[PDB]
Write a protein that binds this ligand. Structure first.
Ligand SMILES: Cn1cc(-c2ccccc2)nc1C#Cc1ccc2nc(C3CC3)c(CO)n2n1
Ligand SMILES: [Mg+2]
Ligand SMILES: [Zn+2]
Length: 313
């Protein structure tokens, strides 16, 4: 109760910034997460014994794939942490509690394959869940771990607070399905621009928490160039493995997933920044102005990909 988590000085300072990288020491990632819960939520939010047991079960249910792994989960939670700390007064006690947990859990038991590959393979999960296939699975795995003995970090909540927090987490995790992001941002664009965006409207909050989830999920484009660039290698290593698997089913994959079309990576990054990342962080900065550093860092990395194309690296 009188037990703080503290971090070495460089981490204690750098963890508050959007562009923080959690480092290559896996054994420090739980401590980093707990540190972030304590400052974002309070040391009273979760029974420490229960939190540590929940963190370790979550970790154990991430797989050793190149990108969609335990480091991705803690990275996406840290970005949520930065957004929540730079927008103190906008969010409920429940929202702060649910959103860091949603982010840690958002890709539970990911196999490194898209919803599309599950559907073309005819994976059982695509019969159980016809849309947002992996995301409904991730929420399912979250509920499972929460129901393990000694793992109910929410046990102290009222029946109905418990229900509101699992419903925040469910919507938050579903929203990481990028197919859903495009319409969600178009609506947020229109509501902000016509002046109708209202944060007391629960369906408006939902959309806004949705956009933050896309922003956190994509935060590798908001890091220092060497982090961003090395993460792109992990991202493509899954996509190309997925393309291999498409070819094994007798299907030409899209070029994004075709390791034979590596040479066109720089132009694909451009499309992605222009079609996905920039619009995401633009609309996010409009709604939540202290998130501007994410937009500024994304634009800097877009300009680094422009340099790659011009053969200036
Ligand atoms: C649309 N597209 C087409 C091609 C392409 C085409 C032909 C040949 C080679 C490549 N590449 C893309 C892109 C990809 C892609 C997808 C998701 C994603 N999340 C992130 C960060 C959030 C972690 C990044 C990093 O920027 N990405 N990058
Ligand atoms: Mg995901
Ligand atoms: Zn993710």
């Amino acid at each position: 109760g009188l037990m703080q988590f503290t971090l070495p000085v460089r981490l204690c300072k750098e963890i508050e910034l959007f562009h923080f990288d959690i480092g290559p020491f896996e054994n420090m990632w739980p401590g980093i997460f707990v540190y972030m819960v304590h400052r974002s939520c309070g040391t009273s939010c979760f029974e420490l014994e229960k939190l540590c047991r929940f963190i370790m079960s979550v970790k154990k249910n991430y797989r050793r794939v190149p990108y969609h792994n335990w480091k991705h989960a803690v990275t996406v939670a840290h970005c949520m942490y930065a957004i929540l700390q730079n927008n103190h007064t906008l969010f409920t006690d429940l929202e702060r509690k649910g959103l860091l947990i949603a982010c840690l859990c958002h890709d539970l038991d990911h196999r490194g394959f898209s919803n599309s590959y599950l559907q073309k393979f005819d994976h059982p999960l695509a019969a159980l869940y016809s849309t947002s296939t992996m995301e409904q699975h991730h929420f399912s795995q979250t509920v499972s771990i929460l129901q393990l003995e000694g793992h109910n970090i929410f046990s102290t909540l009222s029946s109905s607070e418990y229900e509101q927090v699992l419903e925040i987490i469910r919507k938050a995790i579903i929203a990481t399905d990028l197919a859903l992001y495009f319409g969600n941002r178009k609506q947020l664009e229109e509501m902000y621009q016509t002046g109708s965006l209202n944060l007391n409207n629960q369906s408006h909050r939902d959309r806004v928490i949705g956009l933050m989830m896309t922003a956190c999920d994509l935060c590798s484009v908001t890091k220092l160039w060497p982090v961003t660039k090395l993460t792109a290698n992990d991202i493509y290593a899954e996509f190309w493995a997925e393309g291999d698997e498409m070819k094994k089913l007798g299907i030409q994959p899209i070029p994004m997933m075709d390791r034979d079309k590596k040479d066109e990576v720089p132009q694909g990054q451009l499309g992605f920044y222009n079609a996905v990342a920039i619009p995401c962080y633009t609309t996010l900065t409009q709604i939540l102005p202290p998130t501007e550093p994410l937009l500024k860092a994304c634009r800097d990395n877009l300009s680094q990909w422009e340099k790659v194309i011009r053969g200036e690296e």
